[PDB]
Design an enzyme around this catalytic site. Sequence first.
Site, mmCIF file in Angstrom:
data_model
loop_
_atom_site.group_PDB
_atom_site.id
_atom_site.type_symbol
_atom_site.label_atom_id
_atom_site.label_comp_id
_atom_site.label_asym_id
_atom_site.label_seq_id
_atom_site.Cartn_x
_atom_site.Cartn_y
_atom_site.Cartn_z
ATOM 1 N N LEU H 40 47.038 21.813 9.570
ATOM 2 C CA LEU H 40 45.919 21.755 8.630
ATOM 3 C C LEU H 40 44.577 21.879 9.356
ATOM 4 O O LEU H 40 44.223 22.958 9.834
ATOM 5 C CB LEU H 40 45.971 20.468 7.793
ATOM 6 C CG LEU H 40 46.436 19.131 8.388
ATOM 7 C CD1 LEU H 40 46.581 19.145 9.902
ATOM 8 C CD2 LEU H 40 45.518 18.001 7.951
ATOM 9 N N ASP H 41 43.824 20.782 9.396
ATOM 10 C CA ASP H 41 42.552 20.737 10.096
ATOM 11 C C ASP H 41 42.953 20.480 11.529
ATOM 12 O O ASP H 41 43.284 21.410 12.266
ATOM 13 C CB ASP H 41 41.692 19.590 9.580
ATOM 14 C CG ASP H 41 40.219 19.904 9.637
ATOM 15 O OD1 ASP H 41 39.874 21.100 9.735
ATOM 16 O OD2 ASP H 41 39.406 18.959 9.583
ATOM 17 N N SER H 42 42.929 19.225 11.957
ATOM 18 C CA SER H 42 43.407 19.015 13.312
ATOM 19 C C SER H 42 44.798 19.629 13.450
ATOM 20 O O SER H 42 45.423 20.028 12.467
ATOM 21 C CB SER H 42 43.422 17.527 13.658
ATOM 22 O OG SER H 42 44.384 16.828 12.887
ATOM 23 N N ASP H 44 46.001 22.366 14.076
ATOM 24 C CA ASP H 44 46.082 23.808 13.908
ATOM 25 C C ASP H 44 44.876 24.496 14.519
ATOM 26 O O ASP H 44 44.655 25.685 14.273
ATOM 27 C CB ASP H 44 46.203 24.173 12.427
#
Lengths: 114, 49, 173, 458, 167, 91, 68, 86, 51, 551, 53
Positions: H40-42, H44
Site C-alpha cells: 500500500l503506502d509503506s 510498497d
Amino acid sequence: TTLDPAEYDISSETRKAQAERLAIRSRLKREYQLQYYDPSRRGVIEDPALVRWTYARSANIYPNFRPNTKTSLLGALFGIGPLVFWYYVFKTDRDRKEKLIQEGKLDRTFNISY
Amino acid sequence: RDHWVHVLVPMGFVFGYYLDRKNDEKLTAFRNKSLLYKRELKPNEEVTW
Amino acid sequence: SWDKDVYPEPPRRTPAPSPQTSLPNPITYLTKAFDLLVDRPVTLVREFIERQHAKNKYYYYHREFRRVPDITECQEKDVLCMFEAEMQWRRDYKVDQEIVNIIQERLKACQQREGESHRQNCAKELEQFTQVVKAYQDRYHDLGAHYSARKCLAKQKQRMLAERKAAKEAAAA
Amino acid sequence: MLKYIIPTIMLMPLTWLSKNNMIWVNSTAHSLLISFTSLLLMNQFGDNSLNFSLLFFSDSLSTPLLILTMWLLPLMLMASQHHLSKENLTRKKLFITMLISLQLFLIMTFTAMELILFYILFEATLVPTLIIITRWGNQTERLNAGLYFLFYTLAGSLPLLVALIYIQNTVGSLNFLMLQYWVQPVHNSWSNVFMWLACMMAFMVKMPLYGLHLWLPKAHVEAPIAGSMVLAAVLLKLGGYGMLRITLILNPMTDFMAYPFIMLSLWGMIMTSSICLRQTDLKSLIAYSSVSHMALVIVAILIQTPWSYMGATALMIAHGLTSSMLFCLANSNYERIHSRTMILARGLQTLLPLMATWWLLASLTNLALPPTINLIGELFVVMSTFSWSNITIILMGVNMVITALYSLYMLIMTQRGKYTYHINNISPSFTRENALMSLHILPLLLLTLNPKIILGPL
Amino acid sequence: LTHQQKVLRLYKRALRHLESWCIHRDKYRYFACLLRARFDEHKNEKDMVKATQLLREAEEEFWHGQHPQPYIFPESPGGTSYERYECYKVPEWCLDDWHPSEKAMYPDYFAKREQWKKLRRESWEREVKQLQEETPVGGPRTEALPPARKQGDLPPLWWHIVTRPRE
Amino acid sequence: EDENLYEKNPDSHGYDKDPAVDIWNMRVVFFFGFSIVLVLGSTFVAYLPDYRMQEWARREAERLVKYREAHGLPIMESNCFDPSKIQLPED
Amino acid sequence: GKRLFIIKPSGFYDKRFLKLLRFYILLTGIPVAIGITLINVFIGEAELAEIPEGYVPEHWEYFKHPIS
Amino acid sequence: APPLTLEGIKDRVLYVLKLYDKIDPEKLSVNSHFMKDLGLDSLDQVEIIMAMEDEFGFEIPDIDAEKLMCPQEIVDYIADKKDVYE
Amino acid sequence: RHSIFAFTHVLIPVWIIHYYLKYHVTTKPYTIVEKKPRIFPGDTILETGEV
Amino acid sequence: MNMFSSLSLVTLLLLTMPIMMMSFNTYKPSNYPLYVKTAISYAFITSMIPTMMFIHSGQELIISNWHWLTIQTLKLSLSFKMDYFSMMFIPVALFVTWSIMEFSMWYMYSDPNINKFFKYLLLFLITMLILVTANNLFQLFIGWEGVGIMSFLLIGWWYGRADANTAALQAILYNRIGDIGFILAMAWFLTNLNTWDLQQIFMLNPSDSNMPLIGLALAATGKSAQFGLHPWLPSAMEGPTPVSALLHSSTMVVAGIFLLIRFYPLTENNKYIQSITLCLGAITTLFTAMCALTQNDIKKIIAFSTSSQLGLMMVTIGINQPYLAFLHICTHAFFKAMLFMCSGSIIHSLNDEQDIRKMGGLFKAMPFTTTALIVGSLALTGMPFLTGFYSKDLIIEAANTSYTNAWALLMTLIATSFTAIYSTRIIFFALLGQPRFPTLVNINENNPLLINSIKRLLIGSLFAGYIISNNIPPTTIPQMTMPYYLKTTALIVTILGFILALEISNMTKNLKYHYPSNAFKFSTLLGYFPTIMHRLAPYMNLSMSQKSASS
Amino acid sequence: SQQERDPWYDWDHPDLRLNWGEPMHWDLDMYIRNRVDTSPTPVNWNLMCKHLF
C-alpha cells in the site's frame, strides 16, 4: 557527554507559517550559481561571510570593549594568576637546593658536568 | 661600451684591500712579546708586517 | 699510530681448534674462499698507491710554545702582562679538557674487552678516573663562573677559597 | 671588516647607473659575489682571539652570525619582483637602494668593537625599515603599525645612553671590550638595580617577552610586497643579540633579580604558542611561532654557564633560515589567491605537487628530527635548564608537545580537495618560485655535517 | 519532512539496523514479517495524536537498542573507503598551462576540447535571458525548466554536466 | 581604478620577468647562487685548517699524558698555580 | 575495451625544472671531485717527530693536509 | 578491475520482480509504475528496493523514494552513481 | 644475467668499505673493541691446560 | 675476525642505493619494485654470515667510525653495537620485509603513485634498523623520531577522507607524549655520568635510578601501545594493508618495549621499578581482551590481538626474564605480517568489505589461505607444539614461582583463555557459515606473487623456534619444577574456549530464537574511553582555555 | 551563541552544504568544528573511572 544533542522533537502545528526560510537560502544560491557559472571569471568570488568573520574577530573587539564588568577584570585570576604561582615554586628550589649544596654534599665525584 | 657598470665595481675589493694594509704598517708597536710571538733573532716575525 | 702505554690492552689470548666430530662444518667453506676475492682489489691497489704516495713527501712540524710568565704577575692596572697571563691560562684549559677525554676512553677499553665480569676485574679504571674527575671541578672549573671563563679573575679565587677558607679555618686544622 | 662595507656601498651607484629592466639582473649578479669574500678572511683561528684591525672591528670572532646577513639582498630581490613590477623605475631604484642601506649598518653592527659604536648603529636602523612598512604595504592599519614599531624600540633604547655614557666616565672607558679586563663587581643596592634594568630592558623590546610583544604581530601582519623587509625584520630581531656581549661581563653577578624575567618568559613560552592554534590569518600564524622559540633564548642567556651558549647561539640561526622560508612560503601562494585567510586556500596538494616537499621540509624543522641544526640547539638548552631546577622539563616539554600539533595544522589544511571555485590559481610554481624557496634548506641541512662553525667561544 | 514520509525514513532503518544484529541469513528473514507485524498494526486512521502515538512511543524500542556499530555500506557518508579515491581525485580542467611538447600527447582530446566549449562559452544569451524571467523574484530551489522549453543547455553547464568520474 | 596583470605565462616558459635577456637571469642565479658558492665555497670550509686550535691540542694532550705517567708527575693537579706566591691575607 | 584518459595536472615545468639543479651541480662539483681524488694519490703529509725546523721555523703551512 | 555493461542492470531489476511472490511474471517489463499493483503506502515504496538493499544497496538515500515510482527511473541513475556506461 | 646487474650492486662497495677499515684500525687508537674468548678448558694458541 | 662487522656494514650501506639511484642516474626500464625486491634479496644473505660467526666464538664488535662535534668533556661520534640483538634480530626483521613487498606489488598493483610507497617503505626500514644497532642514546633519539614521522606519511597515504589524516594527527600526537619521558632520562645521564654512551653507564650501576627510568617507562608506553595511550593503535589501521602489516607486526610497537630490554643491567634493582611495570603489563591484557569482543572488522580484530601480545611482553620485564622477553618477538614477527597479508587476499577478493559480517564459509574456492589461517590462529591459541611454544609456555611458567602482585597471575593467565575465542570467532563468521554476501562472486587467488609470499613464511613459521631456541646460549637458570594440580592447566585454560565460543556461537545460531535483547550493557566493546576523552580534551583546551588567554 | 556542536558533513545533499563545498553565509563559530562531532549511543554513566576502580 557534550552533548545531548536533541535529535528529535515535536511540531505540527506550532507556528506552521514559519516556512520560506529556505527562500532566503534559495535566493543566495540563485545568486551564487548565477555568479559561479560564467565563461570568463578567472578568480574567486568575494563571499563576505568570510569577510565579516575575520574582521569581526581580528579587529572590532577593542573598539567594542568597555571594562564595565568584572568578568573582563577576571583576567587577573588568569593573566597574573599562575605567574604568581611559578615564582613561589622556583625560589623554594634553588634555596633548599642551595643550602644542601653548600652545607653538606649531595653529588658524587664524577660530576664534571653540570 | 667597456661596461664600467659591470665587473669594474667588484674591482673595488683590491681598492679596499689597499686601504686594509695601511693600518697594520703603522700598528707596528711591539716586536717584544713572550708567547711565540718572539721576534727573537729571526727574519720570521719581522716579515708580513 | 700511537703508543700502547697511552691506550693499553692485554694480549690476545685466543683459543683455537676443537672440532672433535665428522659432522659437516661450513667454516672450511667460508674463510678458505672469500678472503681471496677481497685480497686482489684491496692489497694490490693499496700497495699501488703506497709507492705512488712514496714518490714525494710533505712536512708539518711540532708546534711548541714559549712559557716565560705564569700566574700571579702582574699589577692590577696593567693590560699587557695580564693579557699574556690569560694566553697562558686558556691553553691550560682546552688541554685539560682533553686529558679527561683520554682517561674516559681508557674506561671504554676494559669494559668491551672483558664484558662478562667487568666489575671485579681490571682493578684500575674506576679508581683512576674518579680520582681525576674529582680532581677536575675543584679549582679548575669555575662552577659557576664558567660563562665568561673568567681567566685569572676567578681561576685564582676558587683557589683563594681553597686557601683562605681551607686548611686553617677548620677549627683547628 | 677590512673592506666588506666598501664593496657593498659600491653596489649602490650601480643600480641607478644602469639601463632599463637590466636593473634586476645587474644588482643580483654582483651581490652574490660578496659571499665568497665574506667567507674569505673570516673563519680564522681562534684561541683567544681575533681582534681584527682597529677601533672598527673585533671580526665577530666567536659568534659568526654575519654570513647569513649577506645572503639576503641576493635573496629578496628575486622574492620582491612578484608584485612590485607595476610602479615607476624611479621608485624601483629607491627600494633597492634603501635595502642595501639597511645591510650597510648591519655589517658594522655585530662586530662594532665597542658598546657605544654598537648603540648608534643599533639605532641606525629603524629609519629604512619604517620606510618599507609605511609605503609599500596593502590596505590600512599600516600607519598605526608604523607607530607601534616605534615608541617601544625607541622608548627603551634611550635609557641605554644614560647608562652607557655613565660607564664611559666611571671605569676607564668602554671603547674596547678588551679593556674590560678591569671590571669591578656590581653588588646589591638600590641604584644598581636600575643600572642593570635600564641596560637590559632595551633588548627585551626587540626580542620580546610575553609582555610588550604587542608590536610584533603588527609589522609582520601588515607587511611589504613579498615578505621583502619581513625577511629583514626576522634577522633584526635576532640582531638584538648584544645581551651576549653585555651581560656576560659588566654586572656579572646579578642573578638575584633574573626571576621576573625567567618566569615571565618561561610561562609565556608555553602560552604564546598555545594562543596561535586558532589563528585565521596565515601570516599571523607564523608571526607567533617567531615569538615562542625565540623567547627560549631569553631563559638561555640569563641562565649562564655554557652547554647553553652551545645551544643559544645555534638557536639564533636555527629559525634564521626556517622562519625566513615560512614567510617565503606565505609570500608565495598569495600571488595566486589574493587572501591570507587560511580557510580559502583549500583544494590544494593536487594542483601544485612540486611544492609539497617545500611545505614539509619547512615544517619538519620545527618537529626538528634530531640530525638538523634545530635539535642540536634545543637539546643543549634542555640539558642546561635541567641543571637549574629539575622542574623546568615540564613546561619546556609541553612546549615540545603543542608545537608538534601546531606546525602540522598549517600543513594539513592543504591536504583536502574539490576546490569548489578558483578558475584562477593556474601558475604551476615557476622557476623563480622554487629557486628562492631553495637556498634555504640547502645550507640548513648542509651545516649539520660539521656544525662546529656554529658555536660560541663557548 | 511530511508526516506521510516521516515513518518511511524510520522504516528503512528499522530493518537496516536489524540485519546487523542477526548471525544467520534466515534469522533476519524469519523475523521479516514478524518485524512487519508490529508495523502493520495501525494501517489506516487519522493523522493526529490518535496515530502519532505510533511514533511518539517509537522513540523507545528503536533508539533503545539502536545498532551497536552497525553495517555501514562502505561507500557512504560514513564507513571505510568511502571518500578514499582522492590521490587521483580527478582534477578536471587542470589543462590550462602546459608550455607544449607536453600538449603533443592526446592530439584528438585537445581537438575535442575546443569543440565542447561553444555550449559553455555561448549559452548566456539564451539561458540567462529566461533566468530573469522564469525565476519571479526570489523563489525556491533554482532548477530551470527541465527541457528549458526548447533545449536545456544545461543550466548546470558544464560543471555538473561533465563532472568527475570515479575509479 | 584597478589594473593588474596575470600569470606571466603566455604559453612561453618565462623565468623571472619576460622574454629575452631576462632569460639570462636564471643562469646568473643558478650558476652564481649555488654551483659555485654552494659547491666550491661548501668545499672551502670542509677541509679548512685547524679550527679553534684543537688539532694542536689533540696531539699535545696525547703526548703529555705518558710523560707524566712515566715517572713521578701526577695527573690533573689543580695545584693553585705555584703557591707561596700567594701571600694569603687571613683577615 | 576497458580504456579511459587520465588527467594529470602539470609536469612539464617540473621537468623543465630539476635539470638546472642537477646540471650545474656537476659543472663545478665533478671538476672538484678529481681535486679530492687525484690530490689524495700524489700528495699527502708526513709525519711527526719533529723536525727541529733548523733555527727559524716554517711559516704558515704548519698544517697536515693537501689543500689546507 | 572487472568492468560492467548495461545489459546486466536490466535483468537483476527484472529478476527481483519475479523473486517477489507478491508480483507475478505478467506485469510490464520496464514501466508498470508500481501503482499498477503497488500497495500500500509503506512497504510498497521502500520494500520494493529492500531486496536490492541487500544486493546492490549502496545506502540508497532519502531522495530515492518518490523517483522510484517509474520503474525505469530506478534504472536511470544507478548508472550515474557507480561510474557506469559511457 | 644476473651477471652485470648483480655484480655491480654488492661486489663493488665491499671493495670500498673494506679499504676504509683495514687502513683504519692502525690509525685510530681504538679499533673494534672485541671481547674475550669465553673458554672452559685450555688450549688454542696458548699452552695452558686444565682438569 | 676482521670480517665480523666488515660484512655487517654491507647491510647498513646497501639500502641507501635505491635512494641514490632514485635521483635519476640512468634508471632501469622501469619496473621499480623489482629493483628494490632484488635489492633486499642479496642483503639478507650477507647479514646471515656474521650471525654464524657469533654463535661460534662471540667476538662482539662495537666500532668508532667518524666524529660529530665534540664539546667540553663528552665526545660523541657515532658507533654500532653487535651483541645478541644485532646479530639475532636483524636477519629476522629483514626476512619479513623481503617477504612483504611482493604483496604490495599486487596490493598496490593499480596505483600510479607506486614508486613513493616503495621508497618511503625503504626509508622506514633504515631508521628502524639504525635504532637496534646503536650503542648511543643520541643515536637512539634519531631512530626514535625517524620512525615517528614515517607513520604520518603512511597513515595519511590517501589524501582527503577527513578521518584518515586526523588519525595521522592522533598518530604523531601520542608519540610526543611518548617523547617527554625519553628526553627526561637523557638529561639525567649528563648531569651525573658526564656522557650517555651505553658502555660507561654499565660500568658503575647508578644508585638511585628512581628518576630516569620512570621517564624511560613512559616513553616505553608511547610506542608500545599500553593503557592510557591505547587508542592510538585501533585508528592507526586506516591506511593501506602492507603499511599496517609492517607498522604493527614487526616495527613501531615492539620498539617501545625494546628500549627497556637493552637496559637490563640497570632494571634488575630498585623495587619501585618492577612492581609498576608488571602491574602495567597486566592492565593492558584484559582491557584489550574485553574490547576486542563483538567487533566487526578483520583488521581491528588483528589490531587488538597485536596489542594483547604486548600485555605478556610488558610483564616479561617485571619478572626478570630479559632474553625470554626478546625471544617472543623473534617468534611473533612471523605471525601477523603473514596474517594481515593472509586476510589481505580476502578483502580484495570481495573487493571490499573488511567486515566479520557478510562472509560465509571457508572453502568458497579458498583452499590455500584458509589452510594458512588455521595455523597462525592455532598458534594464537597458545601453542600445542607450534612456533612460539618456546616463548609462550616458558614465560607463563616463569611466573609460576615469583613474588608478584598475586593479582598479576590473576590477570595474565586469565587473558590466555580469552585468546582462544579470538581464534574461532573469525572461523565462525568468515570460515564456517552459509555463504551470505551480495552477489557477483568475483573471487580470484592465483597470482604467484602472493603464492611465493605465503609459502616462504609459513615454512619459516613452523621451524623458527626449533632452530632459534635449539641454537642459542642459555643465560639463566630455568624453573623445571611444576607439581600436582598446579602445572598443566594453562593448556586447559586454552581448551575451555573451544567449548565456550561454539556453545555461544551456536547459541547465536543454535539456540532458541533468543531475539537480540536490546537490554545489554555494552561499554566493553567500545572502551567508553575514546568516546568521552576525545570529545573533552580537544574541547577543553582548544575552545575555552584558548579563547581565554588569547585575544 | 547560535546552535552548535558540529557540521559533521554527512549526506548533505542540497549542495556543498556542510564543510566541503562552502555554502554562502553559514559561518557561526569555527576552527573547533572541522574536528568535533555529534551525540553517541548511551550517556555519561562514567564506568571508565569505574573500570580502573
